[PDB]
Design an enzyme around this catalytic site. Structure first.
Site, PDB file in Angstrom:
ATOM      1  N   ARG A 117       1.714  -9.650   7.558  1.00 37.25           N
ATOM      2  CA  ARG A 117       2.892  -8.920   7.103  1.00 37.25           C
ATOM      3  C   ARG A 117       4.164  -9.753   7.241  1.00 37.25           C
ATOM      4  NH1 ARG A 117       0.128  -4.791   8.814  1.00 37.25           N
ATOM      5  NH2 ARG A 117       1.202  -4.974  10.827  1.00 37.25           N
ATOM      6  N   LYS A 182      -6.351  -4.006  17.483  1.00 40.95           N
ATOM      7  CA  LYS A 182      -6.303  -4.084  16.029  1.00 40.95           C
ATOM      8  C   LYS A 182      -7.679  -4.432  15.471  1.00 40.95           C
ATOM      9  CE  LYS A 182      -3.518  -6.201  12.405  1.00 40.95           C
ATOM     10  NZ  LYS A 182      -2.145  -6.586  11.989  1.00 40.95           N
ATOM     11  N   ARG A 308       3.694  -0.020  23.350  1.00 43.25           N
ATOM     12  CA  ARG A 308       4.482  -0.224  24.557  1.00 43.25           C
ATOM     13  C   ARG A 308       3.798   0.411  25.762  1.00 43.25           C
TER      14      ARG A 308
HETATM   15  O1  LIG Z   1      -1.799  -7.418   9.790  1.00 48.99           O
HETATM   16  C1  LIG Z   1      -1.187  -7.757   8.758  1.00 48.99           C
HETATM   17  O2  LIG Z   1      -0.023  -8.206   8.764  1.00 48.99           O
HETATM   18  C2  LIG Z   1      -1.895  -7.612   7.422  1.00 48.99           C
HETATM   19  C3  LIG Z   1      -3.106  -8.480   7.265  1.00 48.99           C
HETATM   20  C4  LIG Z   1      -3.828  -8.272   5.946  1.00 48.99           C
HETATM   21  C5  LIG Z   1      -5.083  -9.123   5.772  1.00 48.99           C
HETATM   22  C6  LIG Z   1      -5.833  -8.875   4.478  1.00 48.99           C
HETATM   23  S1  LIG Z   1      -7.241 -10.016   4.244  1.00 48.99           S
HETATM   24  C7  LIG Z   1      -7.379  -9.171   2.653  1.00 48.99           C
HETATM   25  C8  LIG Z   1      -5.983  -9.223   2.035  1.00 48.99           C
HETATM   26  N1  LIG Z   1      -5.623 -10.518   1.520  1.00 48.99           N
HETATM   27  C9  LIG Z   1      -4.601 -11.085   2.195  1.00 48.99           C
HETATM   28  O3  LIG Z   1      -4.110 -12.201   1.956  1.00 48.99           O
HETATM   29  N2  LIG Z   1      -4.206 -10.243   3.174  1.00 48.99           N
HETATM   30  C10 LIG Z   1      -4.978  -9.029   3.205  1.00 48.99           C
END
Ligand SMILES: O=C(O)CCCC[C@@H]1SC[C@@H]2NC(=O)N[C@@H]21
Ligand SMILES: O=C(O)CCCC[C@@H]1SC[C@@H]2NC(=O)N[C@@H]21
Lengths: 308, 307
Positions: A117, A182, A308
């Site tokens: 993200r 996660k 937290r």
């Molecule tokens: O945790 C996050 O910030 C989001 C991660 C998202 C990962 C998935 S892998 C499938 C799709 N393709 C990407 O490049 N990202 C998402």
């Protein structure tokens, strides 16, 4: 049996417009008598053909022919593409936004530059975890992507629950958690205009294999064939999104409550580099985060929820 | 960039077994040094590869690769084939019974040898009506094909109702009717073993254009053939799988709402025989309940006609 010439002939007349034997002969590369003969075969197949004497042929009314791709899409509401190597599944769909329809999906075995993200990098080893993305056009504004992400989290968590992992929970606005760790990262990206539609490519990376803050589906005692899990997710996501399109967030409000990992818990709201501390009180009817600070609950329409 | 060789390398190593650089060179048509270099490319992609001296290269555990057809199959539970010209959609599936899975469908624009029930011919002009067929293996015996046909009739009539034809009704054991006129003919054919499964190819021909018979055109209902075929295949797959796990129970109230001949004087035709009575619907197992002289008896065969 080879019926190529009569089949090409009926596709040129399917419009219902007037078609001259000369033009047909040019297209089909045949004489005018032979063009007439292949018109003659079509009428032996039960096709009503009008023969304007000496000038050519026309169908009584336009006919729409059977197409495998058209039939499959209505059956599927979307296509699926498997890519062995790609930079990112989100980028693959983003590069083809002009050619996608709501429901088109994309699974990869290896991502060369998987993305998180906040500019983070998603580690995507070959053939280990699930790297899935799907496109969706929302007729509502770009602000409808909040419900988009919430519905996706509910659908993904539910699908995992039906497969064994009963303690899977969701994170506002998009992530999947298990034992406060996660399990899947969701990345929803959007290009749109306020007062108009929004094109959304959402990408999910689900940790299936173990390789403090991260958990895997293997660690949950769940082993699934990746093709089966990917197909189930694509199928369920498609159904969930069209339900969201026709009924809004209302059906998902009780489901979010059952799945929120942070409701009624001390959390961290991340906007930019800011950190807002408080107790989460779920979401509102529009998907906004309800965050309690010092006993006062204010609605937030953006940011990330942390622990937290 | 060309990634064929590292990808062929990983498909050859996906079994989890040991593969020597010599064997890899044979399959890949490459030297042993270049094979080793491309093994490293796989490791740069996050693939665990062990280099055992004297045994070969191997993955730590077998890995299962992504397949489009496998993924598509679970999304659909069945494939669809459009044939421009064929003798019969039922015959196409029957000729390929060994390769079909429940839900496989088949649509044709023109059928050269359309088939009815008692060997009459279904006239199937090109690009006019819908000529659809679907395969299904029922784990229960061949006697479960009666419920099969009843579910097929209910689903087709329901799909037509949601598309405009609100007065479409069904006929025991298989036909689709509209204003006491035949709108669609269903031909369910099966081969099975008692005490075992039965492979069923059901074929529906729906009259869409006008040329005892009725068409959807004559009812003021116009549907795209691609749309109608796709909706039918989806609903038939869903309806049949519901029938597989819950039986005829969900469809019993639905059959009553759609039965064209319930509580009406009817003719039960078996072979050349003609049995007269009033139809009283179906039972929980799909048998026809026919009232003759005040007594309602269940019949497991024949066709219902009007008198
Ligand atoms: O945790 C996050 O910030 C989001 C991660 C998202 C990962 C998935 S892998 C499938 C799709 N393709 C990407 O490049 N990202 C998402
Ligand atoms: O009324 C009947 O006797 C049954 C007619 C079935 C017609 C359909 S057209 C699609 C499929 N292919 C065939 O040859 N027959 C069925």
């Amino acid at each position: 049996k080879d019926h190529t010439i009569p089949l090409t002939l009926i596709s040129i007349l399917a419009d219902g417009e007037f078609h001259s034997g000369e033009q047909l002969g040019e297209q089909l590369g045949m004489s005018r008598a032979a063009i007439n003969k292949h018109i003659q075969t079509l009428r032996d197949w039960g096709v009503d053909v009008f023969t304007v004497p000496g000038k050519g042929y026309s169908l009584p009314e336009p006919i729409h022919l059977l197409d495998e791709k058209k039939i499959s899409q209505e059956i599927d509401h979307g296509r699926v593409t498997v890519l062995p190597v790609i930079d990112s599944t989100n980028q693959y769909l983003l590069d083809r936004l002009d050619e996608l329809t709501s429901g088109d999906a994309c699974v990869a075995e290896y991502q060369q530059a998987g993305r998180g993200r906040r500019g983070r990098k998603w580690f995507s080893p070959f053939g280990a975890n699930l790297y899935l993305s799907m496109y969706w056009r929302l007729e509502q504004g770009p602000a409808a992507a909040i419900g988009l992400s919430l519905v996706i989290g509910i659908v993904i968590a539910e699908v995992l629950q039906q497969l064994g992992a009963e303690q899977v929970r969701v994170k506002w606005p998009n992530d999947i958690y298990l034992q406060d760790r996660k399990l899947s990262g969701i990345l929803v990206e959007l290009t749109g205009k306020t007062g108009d539609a929004a094109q959304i490519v959402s990408g999910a990376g689900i940790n299936l294999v173990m390789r403090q803050g991260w958990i895997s589906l293997q660690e949950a005692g769940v082993v699934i064939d990746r093709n089966l899990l990917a197909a189930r997710l694509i199928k369920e996501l498609r159904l969930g999104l069209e339900l969201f399109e026709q009924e809004g967030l209302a059906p998902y409000l009780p489901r979010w409550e059952k799945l929120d990992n942070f409701i009624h818990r001390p959390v961290k709201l991340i906007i930019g580099d800011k950190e807002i501390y408080g107790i989460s009180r779920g979401i509102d009817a529009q998907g906004a985060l309800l965050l309690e600070q010092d006993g006062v609950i204010k609605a937030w329409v953006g940011g990330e929820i942390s622990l937290r």
